[PDB]
Amino acid sequence: TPQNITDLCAEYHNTQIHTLNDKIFSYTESLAGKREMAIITFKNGATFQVEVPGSQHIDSQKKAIERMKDTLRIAYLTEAKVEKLCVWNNKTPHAIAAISMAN
Amino acid sequence: TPQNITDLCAEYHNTQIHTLNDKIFSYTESLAGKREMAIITFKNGATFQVEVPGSQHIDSQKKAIERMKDTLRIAYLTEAKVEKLCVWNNKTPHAIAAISMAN
Amino acid sequence: TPQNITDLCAEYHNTQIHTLNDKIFSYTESLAGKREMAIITFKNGATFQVEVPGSQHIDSQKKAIERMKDTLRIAYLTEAKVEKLCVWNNKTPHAIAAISMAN
Amino acid sequence: TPQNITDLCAEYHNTQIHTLNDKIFSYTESLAGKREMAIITFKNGATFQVEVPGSQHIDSQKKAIERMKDTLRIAYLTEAKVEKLCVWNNKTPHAIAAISMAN
Amino acid sequence: TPQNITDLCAEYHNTQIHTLNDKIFSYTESLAGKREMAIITFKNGATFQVEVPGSQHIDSQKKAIERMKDTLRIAYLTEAKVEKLCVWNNKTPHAIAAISMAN
């Protein structure tokens, strides 16, 4: 049972940690069919997605995907510093699995 | 898989990008029957809706329509700069498909 | 396809626009049985309700009623100026159908 | 249909109004089984609960119970003044039925 | 019903109170499958989780688990002082059962 985002990230294949220590520079969200997703960027250009829910996801992830888009939106609006993202690197943009925020 | 709102918008027929770079001027929302919708305007007069859920929508868009109304309200209340809207232009007001926020 | 709250309000019988251009003075909400409602007031004495969900409402309005109470709470707490309310004036207090906020 | 919290409260047995005219001093929330509740206090020593959902609640109260806990949390965090609480006084701590915020 | 977090915590086996009297240092959440959880830390090094929902949880705890992650996120972003945590100590990190916020 993970103590931190790095240990959590290590439990999965196709993942990596991005260390940002920066606020989110842009927040995009779509309701368009088959693109019901969010995209964030940081000021250096690095871009990340919350994937459209699909068959790669188990049912328990569905609530967590909605929570993650809520978290990214409020992090963006509050200018909260993102410490790290755990992402799947077999997608473009890389797909967010987890986020850590620290000051 | 789109990197940004402009590329996302270009995946759909009957769409266009509006570049606002401005906060929302007014936020309206209704619970009246068959008009369960939100309307926003900008200082330049541009007006946009989040459509009432209807037969044009697929199931996966339902939660996303609700999220979009949540996003517009908090964006309005925080005076968040809206960068771009991707809209369907076969409706009046033009119907929001996606939003980007950045400074 | 109304472009504003006034035109939206005119699509319905037994409604009127109240122009407040003021923040909410008080916010009240209840979980008591058969009084699951919100009440707001303005400094000029005007009092409005979000009605308890009932048989007068169609199913699509249910989520919108919940959203309206969310909107009123956060408007109150942020001291956001309410521009107009569309209300049914065949209820006492007048029952909120729509709200517009503008600076 | 009541115009204020006091009139609403008077529609029920085993209730009373507490006047606080103060912000919440502490907010406590639990996910422990059979104690999925919230407790608030004020600096005068007064303590109130939002009861665990139970047999005494009708279906329409369920969403409103959840809303009330949302309300108390955000009230606490924004330091919003609570005017009055309508409570059931046949429970210890007294159980919140309604809240008004003003001033 | 208990009047405070300490009395509530005492109703359960394998629990203890931690007194923090400090804001949350870091907030982490994950949507990865089977690790749909949150982790928080404090500057003293203390680490706590909100557990993945599982068969150890009764139906009524599922909504409360979601609420708790909402609470920790907003507490973190607002820099709200956490007074105490009631936790289960038969998990690592210790698993949050309840939270109190004061000062």
From Swiss-Prot, chains A, B, C, D, E:
Keywords: Disulfide bond, Enterotoxin, Host cell membrane, Host membrane, Membrane, Secreted, Signal, Toxin, Virulence. Disulfide bonds join C9-C86. GO terms for biological process: positive regulation of tyrosine phosphorylation of STAT protein. The keyword Iron does not apply. It is found in: Secreted; Host cell membrane. The keyword Disulfide bond applies. Changing H57A: Loss of toxicity. One of its GO terms (cellular component) is catalytic complex. GO terms for molecular function: galactose binding; host cell surface binding; toxin activity. The holotoxin (choleragen) consists of a pentameric ring of B subunits whose central pore is occupied by the A subunit. The A subunit contains two chains, A1 and A2, linked by a disulfide bridge. This is Cholera enterotoxin subunit B. It comes from Vibrio cholerae serotype O1 (strain ATCC 39315 / El Tor Inaba N16961). The chain holds residues 22 to 124 of 124 of the full protein.
